[PDB]
């Protein structure tokens, strides 16, 4: 939950606010790592693989 | 018209928002 991202009352939408996946860089994100991973990897095969729904 | 048409089609002017999909509030 992030109460600063509360969509206004003038937004109908379907139920969510599917945004540009490249918009993740402007939001807070939990910094969870994998305590067992020897070497992990992101994926950007056409562009960076990320979702961002803002209910 | 000069070759700054790339600025009136994209980038610095025309308000092209590269984060909003085409046909926003429309078909897929």
């Amino acid at each position, epitope marked *: 939950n992030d109460p600063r991202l509360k969509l206004p009352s003038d937004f109908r939408g*379907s139920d969510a606010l599917t945004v540009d996946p490249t918009m993740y860089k402007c939001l807070w994100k939990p910094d969870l790592f994998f305590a067992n991973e020897k070497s992990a990897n992101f994926h950007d095969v056409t562009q960076e693989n990320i979702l961002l729904f803002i209910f | 018209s000069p070759s700054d048409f790339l600025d009136k089609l994209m980038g610095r002017t025309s308000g092209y928002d590269a984060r909003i999909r085409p046909n926003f509030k429309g078909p*897929p």
Partner: antibody
Amino acid sequence: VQLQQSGAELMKPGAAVKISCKATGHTISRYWIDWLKQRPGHGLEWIGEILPGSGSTNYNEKFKGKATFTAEKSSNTAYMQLSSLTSEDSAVYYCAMGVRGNYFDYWGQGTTLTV
Amino acid sequence: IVMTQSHKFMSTSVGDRVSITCKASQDVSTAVAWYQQKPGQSPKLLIYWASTRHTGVPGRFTGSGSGTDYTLTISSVQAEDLSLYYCQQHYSTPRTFGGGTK
């Protein structure tokens, strides 16, 4: 791809019935299985959806609690349970499925319910 | 969203052009599907996204309209086109249909 439901059902008030949706042609944990309600006199109505593998469900706000979606990968079938049956529940219940969108292009033969 | 069909029953002769209006409640602008349910069978899909056809549908069914006001269209009504026609929005989560037209 095909969806083979159970047979007709007859229940009494206060009871609860469970309607199945036997997916014959694909793994049940593959696609969303939607559930609809057709009450005569009125029109169709969307109950909800269940992805039979991840146990995720998105019920309609009118059918919260009234309907419960479950799945069982042992036989590739998606279930729905109607609790607190009343005379308003007299209708036909379908289990649609939309593959390439939020439309309903795969349907079930129907399961008549009569409280 | 509250999809609406203001004509429960329509009259048409074999070989006519009839338009079925499904006036949406808010702006979906493409999210509309049209179903046909003969008596005693599941409603089969005809149109989705208000202008596309389903695999195995006759070419006389044509969807149109956008925004709020939508419309189905049958160019040459055959004998099998005497059934119930449901419109359906697939834009939001609660997927109302809109009653039905006959």
